[PDB]
């Protein structure tokens, strides 16, 4: 009733769980215990951009977190979303804070996803494009402390009037229209997403990080999703 | 609180209103009293396909209802949706029946729509692709007697087990995610849609017709939307 | 100077090479000796549709040849196009005949391909859409006996005035604009293509088959590309 | 044999022709004598972005040249490209210099274009995406002094090693694949393009300007296309 696949950006390495010793990216299937991990070179206060693709033919969850001038960090995990995700899913954004401070602002957001059938070709599909959120932003489902329009951006985490990334925070947002994972006569399916993000830390010990996650249209933030729980996974591991 | 712009397919010409004397297409702004009209050559039991575009620069509501081998029928009206539609709209499908019988089945359905901002370029946008509806069809909002999956199609109107188009009927359906008409820093906006439809009449006196309409996320079928009221307009004219 | 990756549709099983004992699909890297194979259930005179995807993160050449009502046939091979294809490639269509007769008509043709950079996001990319070829068809590069506009279709192989698939034939066609495989600051690349095809055989012993292939902008049909050589590979194996 | 429709960015107002008295934008059909004009507020050394759309239903050439924080400048002209452009066209970029200096660098470039037929729906079409040009840039046709990869950008005009916009210059570039304006069974056609540009002037008296133009696959720069001739129109007016 509340299951999710997440692609997470980890700034604050919680050794106690199983994350490497520095900032890392990887795939989480069912829990905080990411299945695959990788090391990315944090650039505090710098502009970033994430990417993520997959499909049934191959069924391989892959990611690419890039930085300008800086070199690429990727990770790939083999999994059957067919077996994991609800036939119909929802797409949103999560970011987190707790003891540590950090900014979680989204500049641009893009989502592509299609479904190939038996009939002939070019069956079903959907796209959502973002470069600036509004005070309106009505085809979006925000959770908790997310803020849209702050500075004309999707700000997952709590911010002040001067910047000052707040702590002990948590919220998220998902596109209105559900998504279609797999189907009766579908033999070739696909998903594509990219997203620029902006993490800012006055501290050298930045918060927790960000995260792009897939779950049920019903997905809700659990208890103390705060902290390293990036509001993707309850206390279970 | 319940306003709409509609592109309608009129099979049953109700002289009493203002529709020409044979089947016609045109633009309806606020009421049944379509603003522009045109004559299209009905092909009962044959496969059809509608199209419709517009934008602010130009602000001209235009349409093209085609038939294979058959020649094109188009109509164009000058209007300010900026002035008419809610800043945030919804996209759906309507078809109608009353004293007259006719089929209103959708084979394929496509929706494209984008928003150009000041920042730089390629700001906001969305796409929805359809070639076959499901028993599921969960990212769709159906109204009344619409049926999804019947034969793997979106069937706006009431059908029997042998075909037999039902009469005195009415229903519709809209994509889940709202749409974004105009905005703060948007100076160049656009909308694009095409759709194949299938109207079937055992009778020579076919029902009412079909209709592609834009309204509020709140849009609901009025009283006796049945008949020529194609469930787009209440009794007001 | 003349290298290619091909996704081929094999109707006429030439045991002497290494193809299974019935019609099959698979990946060919450098030669006729396809690297991966699979069994698809031919439906002579019936409408078909092929699909094919891949990318660097994963680097896995995958395919899906479907038939309506009929079940799916797929194959997947792990390869480094980065290491194989010219930084800049060309996209076309090949089909073949020799001792055996068969039809090789294309109804629809679709090509999607993009390149993700370091700068920010949504870097480079291209699309080409086909549902009917012309007597014109000017942004297409046809080779040999291919015919465009015959019946408003791309007909790779030689046809008569009554149908009568010709034999001992060979030709192909590619989109004008070159394609961009990999690049300096590209860390996330992708390719997507689908295509409906129509193979017709008065005989029970149909020709050779079809094939979607990637090569150099310079790609030319070799000697006796005819036969099982599907005009993709010279005599080398 | 050499005809063109152009959307031009005019920095250097040549009163002697018919351009207003300050920088302006407008539509040129057959000649320098733009048919429609409008006033845009130049921002030297600042980042800009142009847009342009049209189609048969409506047949209205429209444009939007925007600047960040700054307000929009648009122009619209009614014309029959069906009657003017070759059934098959080419898409490129032009910029100009002469007595006056100015920079003409392109950051991003985007092209969308489709063709609706009788068959059913979603007939033909093409897309080209740009955010950074290469030393390679092989699916592009550059003319004269255009430079690709200079700083990872398409630089239409002649630049030095320190910047120093050169004078008395002229060149352009077009996408490889031709374009399809109108056709046999096409009743609903469309074209869409946006583009960010960067004009830089050490002087207060900047060169000539930029220009997005449509012509024949054969289009070549005429004599002294230099100057206000923005290399779009020969000496004829
Ligand atoms: Ca952690
Ligand atoms: Ca009527
Ligand atoms: Ca063979
Ligand atoms: Ca001038
Ligand atoms: Mn972790
Ligand atoms: Mn009417
Ligand atoms: Mn073989
Ligand atoms: Mn001028």
The residue ranges of every structural domain in chain D are 1-237
- Going from the Cα of C34 to the center of ligand 3, the distance in angstroms, rounded, reads 10
- The DSSP code sequence of chain B is ---EEEEEEE-S--TTTT--SS-EEEEEESSSS-SEEEE----TTSEEEEEEEEETTT-EEEEEEE-SSSPPEEEEEE--HHHHS-SEEEEEEEEE-SSS----EEEEEEEEEEEE-SSSS--EEEEEEES---S---SEEEEET-EESSSSSEE-S---SS----SS-EEEEEESS-EE---TT--EEEEEEEEEEE---SSSS---EEEEEEEETT----TT--GGGTTT--S--
- Going from the Cα of B201 to the center of ligand 8, the distance in angstroms, rounded, reads 58
d(CA D122, CA B75): 20
CB proximity list for C117: less than 8 A, separation 6 or greater: C123, C124, C183, C185, C186, C187, D131, D132
Residue C146 and residue C92 in contact, taking contact as beta carbons nearer than 8 Å = no
d(CA C75, CA A70): 36
Residue C190 and residue C55 in contact, taking contact as beta carbons nearer than 8 Å = yes
Residue C39 and residue C234 in contact, taking contact as beta carbons nearer than 8 Å = no
Sign of torsion over alpha carbons D71, D76, D81, D86: negative
d(CA A85, CA C77): 26
- Residue B67, Cβ density class (10 Å: 0-12 exposed, 13-18 middle, ≥19 buried): middle
> Which residue does chain C place closest to A56, by CA atoms?
C62
As a whole number of Å, the end-to-end CA separation of chain C is: 17
Report how far Cα B153 is from the mean position of its chain's Cα atoms. 16
CB proximity list for C112: less than 8 A, separation 6 or greater: C126, C127, C191, C192, C193
Secondary structure (3-state) at D134? coil
Residue D186 and residue D116 in contact, taking contact as beta carbons nearer than 8 Å = yes
Sign of torsion over alpha carbons B86, B90, B93, B94: negative
**D32: part of which helix (H) or strand (E)?**
none
- The DSSP code sequence of chain C is ---EEEEEEE-S--TTTT--SS-EEEEEESSSS-SEEEE----TTSEEEEEEEEETTT-EEEEEEE-SSSPPEEEEEE--HHHHS-SEEEEEEEEE-SSS----EEEEEEEEEEEE-SSSS--EEEEEEES---S---SEEEEET-EESSSSSEE-S---SS----SS-EEEEEESS-EE---TT--EEEEEEEEEEE---SSSS---EEEEEEEETT----TT--GGGTTT--S--
Residue D18 and residue D28 in contact, taking contact as beta carbons nearer than 8 Å = no
Which ligand has its closest atom nearest to the C-alpha of B39?
6
d(CA D142, CA D134): 12
Q: Among residues D52, D48, D53, which one has the least CA distance to residue D71?
A: D48
Residue A160 and residue B168 in contact, taking contact as beta carbons nearer than 8 Å = no
8 Å CB contact of A177 and B180: no
Assess A119–B contact: CB distance below 8 Å, yes or no. yes
Residue A99 and residue A205 in contact, taking contact as beta carbons nearer than 8 Å = no
Q: Say which of A123, A126, A131 has its CB closest to residue B128.
A: A126
d(CA B55, CA B216): 18
Which residues share a beta bridge with A192?
A53, A112
> Which residue does chain C place closest to D131, by CA atoms?
C123
Q: Among residues D185, B120, D208, which one has the least CA distance to residue A131?
A: B120
Q: Say which of B130, B132, B177 has its CB closest to residue A176.
A: B177
d(CA A142, CA A138): 10
HSE of D133, CA atoms in CB hemisphere, 13 A = 26
Which residues share a beta bridge with B171?
B95, B144
Tokens of C65: 């040849």
Distance of residue A24 Cα from the nearest chain B Cα, in angstroms: 30
> Which residue does chain C place closest to A108, by CA atoms?
C121
Which residues share a beta bridge with C28?
C6
Which residues share a beta bridge with B189?
B115
Which ligand has its closest atom nearest to the C-alpha of A32?
5
Report how far Cα D52 is from the mean position of its chain's Cα atoms. 10
d(CA C44, CA C227): 19
CB proximity list for D174: less than 8 A, separation 6 or greater: D90, D91, D92, D93, D140, D141, D143, D219
Q: What SS3 string covers chain A?
A: CCCEEEEEEECCCCCCCCCCCCCEEEEEECCCCCCEEEECCCCCCCEEEEEEEEECCCCEEEEEEECCCCCCEEEEEECCHHHHCCCEEEEEEEEECCCCCCCCEEEEEEEEEEEECCCCCCCEEEEEEECCCCCCCCCEEEEECCEECCCCCEECCCCCCCCCCCCCCEEEEEECCCEECCCCCCCEEEEEEEEEEECCCCCCCCCCEEEEEEEECCCCCCCCCCHHHCCCCCCCC
Which residues share a beta bridge with B211?
B8, B94
- Going from the Cα of C9 to the center of ligand 3, the distance in angstroms, rounded, reads 9
**D97: part of which helix (H) or strand (E)?**
none
d(CA B126, CA B191): 10
d(CA B33, CA B17): 7
**Which one-letter DSSP state was computed for residue D76?**
E
How many interchain CB pairs under 8 A, B with D? 100
Distance of residue D1 Cα from the nearest chain B Cα, in angstroms: 31
d(CA C145, CA D198): 47
d(CA D142, CA A36): 45
Q: Say which of D123, D130, D175 has its CB closest to residue C131.
A: D123
HSE of B57, CA atoms in CB hemisphere, 13 A = 29
How many interchain CB pairs under 8 A, A with B? 84
d(CA B182, CA A135): 14
Q: Is A152 left (phi over 0), alpha (psi -120 to 50) or beta?
A: left
Secondary structure (3-state) at D84? helix
CB proximity list for D101: less than 8 A, separation 6 or greater: D165, D166, D167, D201, D202, D203, D206, D207
Contacts of C58 in chain A (CB under 8 A): 53, 58, 60, 62, 76
d(CA C188, CA C56): 6
Q: Say which of D119, D134, D180 has its CB closest to residue C131.
A: D119
Contacts of D196 in chain B (CB under 8 A): 120-121
Assess A192–B contact: CB distance below 8 Å, yes or no. no
Q: In whole angstroms, how far apart are CA D235 and each of C20, D9, D33, D37?
A: 67, 19, 11, 20
Contacts of A196 in chain C (CB under 8 A): 120-121
- Residue B120, Cβ density class (10 Å: 0-12 exposed, 13-18 middle, ≥19 buried): middle
d(CA B136, CA A187): 18
Residues 56-95 of B with CB under 8 A from A: 87-88
Residue D74 and residue D67 in contact, taking contact as beta carbons nearer than 8 Å = no
**D25: part of which helix (H) or strand (E)?**
strand D24-29
Contacts of C192 in chain A (CB under 8 A): 190
Tokens of C91: 């996209």
Tokens of B50: 């509608």
Assess B99–D contact: CB distance below 8 Å, yes or no. no
8 Å CB contact of A76 and C62: no
d(CA C225, CA C211): 12
Secondary structure (3-state) at D107? strand
Q: Say which of D108, D116, D122 has its CB closest to residue B121.
A: D108
Classify A1-237 by CATH class: mainly beta
d(CA D110, CA D88): 19
Q: Say which of D87, D122, D134 has its CB closest to residue C131.
A: D122
Contacts of B136 in chain A (CB under 8 A): 87-88
Residue D126 and residue D118 in contact, taking contact as beta carbons nearer than 8 Å = no
d(CA D226, CA D216): 20
Tokens of C13: 């099983």
Tokens of C22: 């019935």
Q: Among residues A150, A129, A137, which one has the least CA distance to residue A198?
A: A150
* Backbone φ, ψ for residue C228 (5° rounding): -80, -10
Which residues share a beta bridge with D6?
D28, D213
Tokens of B180: 């974004």
Q: Is D58 left (phi over 0), alpha (psi -120 to 50) or beta?
A: alpha
d(CA B202, CA B100): 10
8 Å CB contact of D116 and B55: no
Q: What SS3 string covers D139-206?
A: CEEEEECCEECCCCCEECCCCCCCCCCCCCCEEEEEECCCEECCCCCCCEEEEEEEEEEECCCCCCCC
Q: Among residues C161, C157, C160, which one has the least CA distance to residue C208?
A: C157
Contacts of C47 in chain A (CB under 8 A): 120
As a whole number of Å, the end-to-end CA separation of chain D is: 17
> Which residue does chain A place closest to C66, by CA atoms?
A118
Tokens of D84: 């003017």
Best mutation target among B118, B127, B184 (most D Cβ atoms within 10 Å) is B118
8 Å CB contact of D74 and B57: yes
Q: Tokens 């792009």 label which residue?
A: A212
CB proximity list for A204: less than 8 A, separation 6 or greater: none
d(CA C210, CA C208): 7
- Going from the Cα of C198 to the center of ligand 3, the distance in angstroms, rounded, reads 18
Tokens of C66: 């479907």
Residue C108 and residue C101 in contact, taking contact as beta carbons nearer than 8 Å = no
Q: In whole angstroms, how far apart are CA B193 and each of B48, B71, C130, D179?
A: 14, 20, 18, 22
Residue D64 and residue D98 in contact, taking contact as beta carbons nearer than 8 Å = no
Q: Say which of B87, B123, B129 has its CB closest to residue A132.
A: B123
Q: In whole angstroms, how far apart are CA A227 and each of A18, A188, B82?
A: 15, 38, 44
Pairing of β B47-55 and β B60-66: antiparallel
Residue A63 and residue A47 in contact, taking contact as beta carbons nearer than 8 Å = no
d(CA D177, CA D131): 19
Residue A157 and residue A174 in contact, taking contact as beta carbons nearer than 8 Å = no
As a whole number of Å, the end-to-end CA separation of chain B is: 17
- Going from the Cα of B13 to the center of ligand 2, the distance in angstroms, rounded, reads 4
8 Å CB contact of B136 and A88: yes
8 Å CB contact of C76 and A57: yes
The b-or-e profile of C60-76 (16+ CB within 10 A means b, else e) is bbbbbbbbeeeebbbbb
Contacts of D64 in chain B (CB under 8 A): 57, 116, 187-188
Q: Tokens 């641009």 label which residue?
A: A108
Q: In whole angstroms, how far apart are CA B96 and each of B8, B224, C176, C218, D3?
A: 10, 11, 46, 57, 49
> Which residue does chain B place closest to D194, by CA atoms?
B121
Residue C169 and residue C97 in contact, taking contact as beta carbons nearer than 8 Å = yes
Contacts of D63 in chain B (CB under 8 A): 57
d(CA D206, CA D162): 18
**Which one-letter DSSP state was computed for residue D72?**
P
- Residue A27, Cβ density class (10 Å: 0-12 exposed, 13-18 middle, ≥19 buried): buried
d(CA B156, CA B147): 6
Q: Tokens 């009917």 label which residue?
A: C132
Tokens of C103: 């039809």
Assess C49–A contact: CB distance below 8 Å, yes or no. yes
Q: What does the radius of gyration of chain A's CA atoms come to, in whole angstroms?
A: 17
- Going from the Cα of B39 to the center of ligand 8, the distance in angstroms, rounded, reads 42
**Which one-letter DSSP state was computed for residue D81?**
H
8 Å CB contact of A49 and C120: yes
d(CA A57, CA A182): 12
8 Å CB contact of C176 and D180: no
Secondary structure (3-state) at D82? helix
CB proximity list for A78: less than 8 A, separation 6 or greater: A59, A60, A61
Count the neighbouring beta carbons within 10 Å of the beta carbon of residue B18: 12
CB proximity list for A161: less than 8 A, separation 6 or greater: none
8 Å CB contact of A127 and B123: no
Assess C183–A contact: CB distance below 8 Å, yes or no. no
8 Å CB contact of B47 and D120: yes
d(CA B227, CA B207): 8
8 Å CB contact of B70 and D118: yes
Length of chain D: 237
Q: Say which of C66, C68, C76 has its CB closest to residue A58.
A: C76
Tokens of D227: 């100057």
d(CA C105, CA C8): 15
Contacts of B125 in chain A (CB under 8 A): 127-129
Q: Among residues D12, D61, D40, D3, which one has the least CA distance to residue D230?
A: D12
8 Å CB contact of D114 and C129: yes
């Amino acid at each position: 009733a509340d299951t999710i696949v997440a692609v997470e950006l980890d700034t604050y390495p919680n050794t106690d769980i199983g994350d490497p010793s520095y900032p890392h990216i990887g795939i989480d299937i069912k829990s905080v215990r990411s299945k695959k991990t990788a090391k990315w070179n944090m650039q505090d206060g710098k502009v970033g951009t994430a990417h993520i693709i997959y499909n049934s033919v191959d069924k391989r969850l892959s990611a690419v977190v890039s930085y300008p001038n800086a070199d690429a960090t990727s990770v790939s995990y083999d999994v059957d979303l067919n077996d994991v995700l609800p036939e119909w899913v929802r797409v949103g954004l999560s970011a987190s804070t707790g003891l540590y401070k950090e900014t979680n602002t989204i500049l641009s957001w893009s989502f592509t996803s299609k479904l190939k059938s038996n009939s002939t070709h070019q069956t079903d599909a959907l796209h959502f494009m973002f470069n600036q959120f509004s005070k309106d932003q009505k085809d979006l489902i925000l959770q908790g402390d997310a803020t849209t329009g702050t500075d004309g951006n999707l700000e997952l985490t709590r911010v002040s009037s001067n910047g000052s990334p707040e702590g002990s925070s948590v919220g998220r947002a998902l596109f209105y229209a559900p998504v279609h994972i797999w189907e009766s006569s579908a033999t070739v399916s696909a998903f594509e997403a990219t997203f620029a993000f902006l993490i800012k830390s006055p501290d050298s010990h930045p918060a927790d990080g960000i995260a792009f996650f897939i779950s049920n249209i019903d997905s809700s933030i659990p208890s103390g999703s705060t902290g390293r729980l990036l509001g993707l996974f309850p206390d279970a591991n």
